[PDB]
Amino acid sequence: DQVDYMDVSTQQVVSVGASLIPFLEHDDANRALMGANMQRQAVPTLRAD
Amino acid sequence: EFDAIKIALASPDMIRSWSFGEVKKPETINYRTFKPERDGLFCARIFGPVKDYECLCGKYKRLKHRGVICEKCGVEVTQTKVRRERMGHIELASPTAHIWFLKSLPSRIGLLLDMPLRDIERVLYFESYVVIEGGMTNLERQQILTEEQYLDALEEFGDEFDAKMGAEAIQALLKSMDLEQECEQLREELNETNSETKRKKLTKRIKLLEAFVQSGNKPEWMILTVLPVLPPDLRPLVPLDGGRFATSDLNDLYRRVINRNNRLKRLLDLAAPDIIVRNEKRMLQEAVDALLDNGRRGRAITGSNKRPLKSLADMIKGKQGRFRQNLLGKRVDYSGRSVITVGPYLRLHQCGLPKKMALELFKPFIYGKLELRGLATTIKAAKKMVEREEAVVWDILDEVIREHPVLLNRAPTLHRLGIQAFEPVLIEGKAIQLHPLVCAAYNADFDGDQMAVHVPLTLEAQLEARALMMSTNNILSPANGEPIIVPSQDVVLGLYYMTRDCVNAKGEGMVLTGPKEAERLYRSGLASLHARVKVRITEYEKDANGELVAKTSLKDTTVGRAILWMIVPKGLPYSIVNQALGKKAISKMLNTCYRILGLKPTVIFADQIMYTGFAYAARSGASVGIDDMVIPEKKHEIISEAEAEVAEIQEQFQSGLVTAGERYNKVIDIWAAANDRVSKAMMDNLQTETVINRDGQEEKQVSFNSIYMMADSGARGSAAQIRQLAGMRGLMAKPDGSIIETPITANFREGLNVLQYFISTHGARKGLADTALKTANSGYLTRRLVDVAQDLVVTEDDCGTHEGIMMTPVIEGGDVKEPLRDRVLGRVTAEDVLKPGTADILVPRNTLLHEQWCDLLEENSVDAVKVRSVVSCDTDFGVCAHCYGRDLARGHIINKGEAIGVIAAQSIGEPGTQLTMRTFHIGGAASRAAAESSIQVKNKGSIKLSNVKSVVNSSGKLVITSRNTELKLIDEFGRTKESYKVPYGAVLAKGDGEQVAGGETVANWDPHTMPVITEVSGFVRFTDMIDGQTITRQTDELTGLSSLVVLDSAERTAGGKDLRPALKIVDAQGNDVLIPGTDMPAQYFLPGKAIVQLEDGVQISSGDTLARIPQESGGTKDITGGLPRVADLFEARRPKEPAILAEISGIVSFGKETKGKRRLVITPVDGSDPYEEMIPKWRQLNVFEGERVERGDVISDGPEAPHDILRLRGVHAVTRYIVNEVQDVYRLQGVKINDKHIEVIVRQMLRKATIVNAGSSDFLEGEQVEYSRVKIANRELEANGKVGATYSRDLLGITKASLATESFISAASFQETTRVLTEAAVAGKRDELRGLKENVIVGRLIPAGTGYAYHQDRMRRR
RNA sequence: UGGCAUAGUUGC
DNA sequence: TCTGAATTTACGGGCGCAACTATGCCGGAC
DNA sequence: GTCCGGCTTCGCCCGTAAATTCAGA
């Protein structure tokens, strides 16, 4: 009964960089950080996949 | 050419001698024509021609006019190289004070005039007057007059009277001082004084005055009248994109000093009013100060973009200055960089170098080969051939790369194995292929790492690379004896899979005719790699005089073990490959091969190990899945039990039974226990997971699970990371080393919901911050260690010293960590080790303790060996080979010349930095123990106690009332088998000298609180306490009782600051109950935040806890928090509550007890009775009025200052203390460092000594001089009939020891370049450049390696 | 044709 | 009213290595 | 376009010198 509010979505705690990592919850937070930083560096290939 | 560097003050005559022409105009370039101005900062007649052998106006443009000076403009036709070294000068309109000597802190000018810095600053910058030649007036010499005082003096003392203002006044004061006369008065006053602070000031003044007198300097030269000007090419104007030139910094400063100087000259030409010229003089002084050292005075003047200009001081000092940017480390030609790859096919001595970098690096060699073979007569032709990459220059490249080593270096060269020489193999690619084995040495993973290739050019450099730096020579780490080329992760996994067994596999039980048969069976598919069989193995034992003796037998082994045996060399035993062969097993295998066979067999064995491990790891197909991280079935119930425990502890806390800190500690400990239980259950379910049978009953075996198979083998990961994968991942730690009491209940195979993935980010932020922010501490520490210990080089082979240190096995409170085998290995003994039985010489006096001698000691069960230490060496300027011991990079004694100081500094500094940057490898999980609370003896044996003063309580249980009680489990042979630390206030089940059996506790206590147990019985009195400010009392009205907490110095009131709450035990009549047979009351002082649950006047018994102080939490105990302790140890920091020791032995007596600062007195038997000590009465005293005391005995408890240990217990005591203290920190982190490095660092710390009696020598009374110099002077004196001067050794921090060195170049390159240079200039110091750093800076052969012979020859041929 | 500043990034 | 020791306060030095990319680089009178 | 000039505070640690405060005579 005391609940005054609820989180709108489960993604709201992260940003648009770490929200693109599937199975983030199973990754060590350092490795999620590195995964996002490295998604920011990926070069566009000839064809998207 | 030269052999020393002389530094001294630059007199105006000397400055004029340097300069080739006065600079007069503040213009550099016309900005329309790029020619230099007439007589500006950039000039041609002053500084030289712009172009080589060409006049400015073009009158002469050829070498035929080399020397003549054109009359049209006046430019000496010569090369432009001179323009790089031709200085100029500026004739300052008024004298100007040099800022360095004004604000050096201490200020040279300030204390040469015996004037405070504030007043001399006021005088210099034209805000007050100072009197010169006061004469028969109402004015003193150094007295100061403001504008009002100056007006009063002028109107009242218009007669002969001089009170100047500004730098001219200071120069007049300096010139009007007789240095020797002042020395006489200051010295005779020092002998006729009584104070101590004034004594220090007077002796400092005398030292400065004597430094000035001895050197050729003069005081007035400290005030600049002629300002030198740097040669233009060192402050160049380089064109920027467009017409605009580079906005140089020195040019602006020089050009706004000429402006003020010219303005002031013009004003003085026309006799401007005094105020305007005064302000102009002040501005000139400020401009010169900014030029010499910008920002030192304040208001760092900033150019365009508001960036402070880089002054000369800023250019020579700091990390971006010349010393640490262009002289100690330089950019080098013949160097390239590239990403690194694996290339497993390489041998240990070769590296894959790309063809393109190979061509680009070896261009001159290719040109030489082309000229030699006649394919290109002129170098232009050869260059053209190379740039086209013709088919023939590649053959030249292969021919010239054959036997030309290349250095490969990774960026953080933490230790000497970060740069190693390899033979290049030309590779078709763009990445360097680096051997897998050396990666561990480089710390080079292949996830984007880059490495740099350098090419040795000269024959000496190539041979040094081939014979010193080849990867096949660096088998053993220089920090310890362990191998460094141990196979890392894939090879060890392959070997672990190969050498293993299961109860039932293909081809089990069959008898094989040899390893070759085993390999044939495995390849043919008839037998599994891991199946128990019998194999006829022939092993070679060389127990004879170097003769390998064969021995054939039938070993019960496996197919994989037999196959691997084909790779082992001859001399090794078979049992070396009859185990699971984890990573440690393989490391021991390589080490034993090295010690028994040699180097080449070890290199070949390592290469074959790598190949076979890779091959069989590939064959095994060892993969990782999601079903391999099996969750334990006991995890949930452990979690529930821990949650019930935290719930009940919280319930107790809300009732007030416990305070917040101890509740937090208890929660942390119970969660750590639950995490350990979960990890243990996980490993139990994981290791024996597989039960396999098809021939009868079930038989358990060690699991083939991939996660376990990789964790057990030591390939990658440990208990912590697999625990986080499968078991609960436990507590986290914040960046400030604070543990989040909320655990994480889910592993990584399970979710980690949003809330749990928010606590984790705290630990992840901690791990990444410690990598990027707290690595500067490790780097700074290792730089200090290197710069304090760099000149220390092995010089002699044996000094013939019989002194040493007693090495014993170390048991810090648990089981043996480093047995005597590892503490005396490869070190020369000091005295004969007598057999433990009866006075039988077991090893001679000067035998190096190698493996056989250590095993002999083990089988004879020796407990303590005295060995020669570096710190106890009688060699001047170095260390003989014997006192150092084994090289630890090779198996022999240290070679005569090898630089052990740099090696020691690197060895001590590398693990700290590496672990600091590796802290993020466990996420952020806190490393925690169970907090003990008991002592479970494991083995039968007697129990003895040392440093113990215990009392029996009401229940007959012995209670320890001492701080440093050591409980030793001794064996029936008298050997101390175990040690334990008994905290102050522990209850002992057994007593002293009482037998015990394994597995039964002998001591228990409460780790979260420090009690205040008494010594006698009686009633309790809250003496010298007042409610409100001395204690905070909490009233329990419903119960009717009350509690109270002592509030620490922070909380108590300043009014009545010194109120000491104490519990005084008193008898029924109301008088203090004296402790047994003494003369002082039995009162116990309460420290801050002490929880007293008693009530005034309550009956108590002996051995009862009056109060309990919460012990406060200790955060994550990793390297990041322990490294500061090492830094404090090597810096010799005085602890905040040092233990007071007894200077002299004798009987003890308390004296006046003056004011709450009780006086102690030690009266020897017949020596100096009247020695006295001032001991505050608020701290405890161990010794009272009755007993003997040896010097260096503890009068009170607490941390011991290393200075006191050195002064009282001696050099060996302090070096042992430092070694043990730092080794505790490095053992906690699992760092293996030989004590040789710490011992040599300690030696470098205690390298100075202060004289106490001048004796017959020429030293002063209380000066500090190099211990080596005083020792050699005493040796020379005792050679004749005189008597040497007695000295006292001092302990200095690494920073102070490095800065306080005979050579000013080494200290200048180190911190405090300004201060070091100022002191050197004032003292007129002379540097012999006999160290390593000085020779690096100067650019000559190092006196450590191959250059040691050259330097010795030069000394002989001086 | 080389210097400084700011920002971003890689390996430790 | 003076004088020494210890304490407090102010202030100067230190704060890892190597590497790559980009932009911007002075504001005011003739 | 070509020639000429002098408003930011906000970190942590430690060593050392100067100023203060006791603690007396």
Ligand SMILES: [Mg+2]
């Ligand atoms: Mg890497």
Ligand SMILES: [Zn+2]
């Ligand atoms: Zn000319």
Ligand SMILES: [Zn+2]
């Ligand atoms: Zn020696």
